[PDB]
């Protein structure tokens, strides 16, 4: 088991299997306490040195029974993106990375005048999932999300 320590002393445990990996640690934390992965800043205790997403946890100064530090970077600074409708017409939307893909779709529905279950969004080839926050897809100012029509 691994111990996660947050600001103000709160603690909880995480089980890492089969092998150690930063990417998985964050996914684990997300399931435990609901903190989005892209907001997680992990550091070794008591070193205070940030973990590195690439290198596994065993290959670092980290292992079993060791403590990690979690600080949550809100990453909720407003920004604007573009969503291109089926006809090729792109419109801007004010969003925050902490809002859900579902919330962006509600914004797109109203503007584009199309029911949300009648389409899905894609960014850089891959589809966006309703339950996930926009920040998981690394969207940037005036990025172009594409609208795709169901049947």
């Amino acid at each position: 088991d691994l111990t996660v320590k947050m600001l103000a002393g709160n603690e909880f445990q995480v089980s890492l299997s089969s092998s150690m990996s930063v990417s998985e640690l964050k996914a684990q934390i997300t399931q435990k306490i609901g903190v989005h992965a892209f907001q997680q800043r992990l550091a070794v205790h008591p070193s205070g040195v940030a973990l590195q997403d690439r290198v596994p946890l065993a290959s670092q100064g980290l292992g079993p029974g060791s403590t990690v530090l979690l600080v949550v970077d809100k990453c909720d600074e407003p920004l604007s993106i573009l969503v291109r409708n089926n006809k090729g017409r792109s419109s801007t939307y004010e969003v925050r990375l902490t809002q859900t893909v579902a919330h962006l779709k509600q914004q797109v529905s109203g503007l584009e005048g199309v029911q949300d279950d009648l389409f899905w969004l894609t960014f850089e080839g891959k589809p966006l999932e309703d339950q996930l926050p926009l920040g998981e897809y690394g969207l940037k100012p005036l990025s172009t999300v594409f609208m795709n029509l169901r049947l």
């Binding site: 320590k5 947050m6 600001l7 103000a8 002393g9 709160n10 800043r41 550091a43 205790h45 008591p46 205070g48 040195v49 530090l69 979690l70 600080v71 970077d73």
Partner: protein
């Protein structure tokens, strides 16, 4: 205006965090940059803060009780971690 669910440990955490907030207000006032309305917000937060620490302390064992000055130190470290986003500021704040 979006609330974040917390647990019991957040009460004693907020008292310390806001202790540090007071310590910053005070250091700022030394710079003579704190306007009059702002000075009132300083004095009232200290008033309430002392009222909450006195109320919280009695609710907890003596060996865990802390003074206004003792909590300031903890709050300062916590604030350094948030501003620099780095546990090294830091560690005393627990991360």
């Amino acid at each position: 205006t979006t609330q974040i669910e917390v647990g019991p440990g957040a009460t004693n955490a907020t008292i310390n965090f806001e202790a540090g907030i007071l310590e910053c207000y005070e250091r700022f006032s030394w710079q003579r940059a704190l306007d009059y309305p702002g000075q009132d917000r300083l004095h009232r937060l200290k008033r309430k803060l002392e009222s909450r620490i006195k109320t919280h302390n009695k609710s907890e064992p003596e060996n865990k009780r802390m003074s206004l000055e003792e909590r300031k130190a903890i709050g300062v470290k916590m604030m350094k971690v948030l501003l620099f986003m780095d546990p090294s500021a830091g560690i005393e704040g627990f991360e």
